[PDB]
């Protein structure tokens, strides 16, 4: 077919261009940097109270309150500075797997196996949690949603499609389609104009919120994409796939930057996040352990061996003060 | 010495902890089941019967709550979800049991059903979940066997060299061929279950029909046995 031949020719041209540009591995140039010291993170205050697995969590702007979603159907706000719980929002659907904190903290969005996204306000005058808005229209389960504005929300569903919704009208402002596999993780750039979405097709696609179309694509992972994070500079991102390897890509170079893998790891990267500087990459693994890798040398900076079950979520504070990681053991641990 | 705001925060945290403990006890009191099956398995009929005997087109989960012998059961059915089930299935790694309904009368699709059952059994996160295999739609299977218009050997050649077990007691009112075919299918499923399951993974094979009104009894007995097994370990009996 003419279309198939044209697609094959374009793919071959792209591969040839990448090979020509990628003359040698990037590790050779970066090796000039001195090795980083041993960053032995230690737990400070373990969090208890959840009755089921923790699947999502996000740090707020104040870097004091963090939302957490548990499969029992509960959203709990945990105070890092005190450990006291501020809000506990039961959900009509038990299998909630996504949750996020708005930049201003006025609204919190969540989703589960149901194709309806529920948004609640934590600053109600009465003081009782209520369903502020219910976004409906998705065909698949909500995988992950990240806030970029108090008026509009970007979410990714299991139907291999991402949708931008306007909280005011409550309708799909625009939809992003093209993924062959289910979208798993999402991440927004600092300008909140471009975002990268990973799926089960082992490919990551970069889209523009205003353009409403696919901008770039990034193959290179061997397996399903489980996590995606943006480098603080905003021009690079890091992904964690089921192949037990992490890859860093540049939106401008359109080529792999660094690869993190080892022979002793045969499990997948459930969570991936970057620090404020981006030098240290933190990844959660199914072996009940968390690993810290050097973004420039891929060296094992430290291993967090304290966890009783699989490590579902991981994130760093906006200021980088501490790292909170959630696991299937219904416990969240803060490390510094 | 602590500020009033701090004290109010501690009191609110204590209240939230008490509410969470009450929710925990309520959650533990009830049992949660996952219902799965093929298109022809007849999940809709079973769930409607359960709802009416033991009491938004984009909805992806249908939860039916029924009570047997004062024991609350919450059965979840997957609705508007893509056929790719490798991802969302992991969320059900804490269910007490999975009731998988298989149409034994659909020979062409019995092997796809067997493959799906094998994949569920061998999943890393589902190895701790017992499976209640319900071979539904036995009336059609019996009618086909009596008519003889369809031969199981076309899809399962081992049926030709299969003999009815002597230890098992066939139903007096059932044709020997029907019993032999049902026992062959059950044997296939049991071998699949036992090939890699032991100590913490059990499969319960039973014969049921969509018109049967005693399925809830079998489910309740299965759950009782599963909780017995779990308590044997949780109470240090081993």
């Amino acid at each position, epitope marked *: 077919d003419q279309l198939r031949q044209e697609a094959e020719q374009l*793919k071959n041209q792209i*591969r040839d261009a990448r090979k020509a540009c990628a003359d040698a591995t990037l590790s050779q140039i970066t090796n000039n940097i001195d090795p980083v010291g041993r960053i032995q993170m230690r737990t400070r205050r373990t969090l208890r109270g959840h009755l089921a697995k923790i699947y999502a969590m996000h740090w707020g702007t104040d870097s004091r309150l963090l939302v957490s979603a548990s499969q029992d159907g509960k959203l709990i706000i945990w105070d890092s500075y005190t450990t006291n719980k501020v809000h506990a929002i039961p959900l009509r659907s038990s299998w909630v797997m996504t949750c996020a904190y708005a930049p201003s903290g006025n609204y919190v969005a969540c989703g589960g196996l149901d194709n309806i996204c529920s948004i609640y306000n934590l600053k109600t005058r009465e003081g009782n949690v209520r369903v502020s808005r219910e976004l409906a229209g998705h065909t698949g389960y909500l995988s992950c949603c990240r806030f970029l504005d108090d008026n509009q929300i970007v979410t990714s569903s299991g139907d*291999t499609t991402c949708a931008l919704w306007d909280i005011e009208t409550g309708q799909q402002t625009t939809t992003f389609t093209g993924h*062959t*596999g289910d979208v798993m993780s999402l991440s927004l750039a600092p300008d909140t104009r471009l975002f990268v979405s990973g799926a*089960c*097709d*082992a490919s990551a696609k970069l889209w523009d919120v205003r353009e409403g179309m696919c901008r770039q694509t990034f*193959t*290179g992972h*061997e*397996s*399903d994409i489980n996590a995606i994070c943006f480098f603080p500079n905003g021009n690079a991102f890091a992904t964690g796939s*089921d*192949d*037990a390897t992490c890859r860093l890509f540049d939106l401008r170079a359109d080529q792999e930057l660094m690869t993190y893998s080892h022979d002793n790891i*045969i499990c*997948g990267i459930t969570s991936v996040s970057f620090s404020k500087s981006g030098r240290l990459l933190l990844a959660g693994y199914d072996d009940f352990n968390c690993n810290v890798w050097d973004a420039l040398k891929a060296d094992r900076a430290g291993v967090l061996a304290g966890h009783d079950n699989r490590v579902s979520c991981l994130g760093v504070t906006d200021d980088g003060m501490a790292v909170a990681t959630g696991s299937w053991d219904s416990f969240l641990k803060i490390w510094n | 010495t602590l500020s009033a705001e701090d004290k109010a925060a501690v009191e609110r945290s204590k209240m939230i902890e008490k509410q969470l403990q009450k929710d925990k006890q309520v959650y533990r009191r009830t049992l949660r089941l996952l219902l799965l099956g093929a298109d022809n398995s007849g999940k809709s009929t079973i769930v409607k019967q359960m709802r009416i005997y033991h009491v938004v087109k984009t909805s992806g989960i249908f939860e039916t709550k029924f009570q047997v012998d004062k024991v609350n059961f919450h059965m979840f059915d997957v609705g508007a979800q*893509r*056929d*790719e*089930r*490798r991802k969302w299935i992991q969320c059900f790694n804490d269910v007490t049991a999975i009731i998988f309904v298989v149409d034994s009368s659909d020979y062409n699709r019995l*092997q*796809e059903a067997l*493959n799906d059952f*094998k*994949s*569920i*059994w*061998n*999943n*890393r996160w589902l190895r701790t979940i017992s499976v209640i295999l319900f071979l539904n739609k036995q009336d059609l299977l019996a009618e086909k066997v009596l008519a003889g218009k369809s031969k199981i050997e076309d*899809y*399962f*050649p*081992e049926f030709a060299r299969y003999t009815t077990p002597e230890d098992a007691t066939p139903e007096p009112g059932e044709d020997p061929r029907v019993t032999r075919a049902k026992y062959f299918i059950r044997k296939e499923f049991v071998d699949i279950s036992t090939a890699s399951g032991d100590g913490r993974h059990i499969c319960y094979p039973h014969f049921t029909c969509s018109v049967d009104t005693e399925n809830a009894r079998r489910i309740f007995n299965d759950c009782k046995d599963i909780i017995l097994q779990m308590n044997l370990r949780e109470y240090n009996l081993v």
Partner: nanobody
Amino acid sequence: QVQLQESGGGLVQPGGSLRLSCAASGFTFSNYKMNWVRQAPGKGLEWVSDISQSGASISYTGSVKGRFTISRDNAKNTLYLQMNSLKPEDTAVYYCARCPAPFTRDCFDVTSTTYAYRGQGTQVTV
């Protein structure tokens, strides 16, 4: 890029034999369970056979159990499937499916034309 190219097949009279070669590139062949599936015209996909990562365990569907043979070579990362005594009912498009994750014996490579680790198929007609 995860590329899984299938080669071989064609028109063969009844009672003949065929061998379909499946070539992999971009991933470690030895770390993944390989599956062979078929989709007859006007019908859904049907699973044919699979081979474990090391090749020590092999399974076949009852339709062609003991007739077709599946073998894998890790030196060239290629997978062969030899078919014998073809019949008209075997006319279908055969796909080389990979398992979604490594180090696991459970695979879901029978998805209805949305799987990512399945190739573009070979049309075998009789």
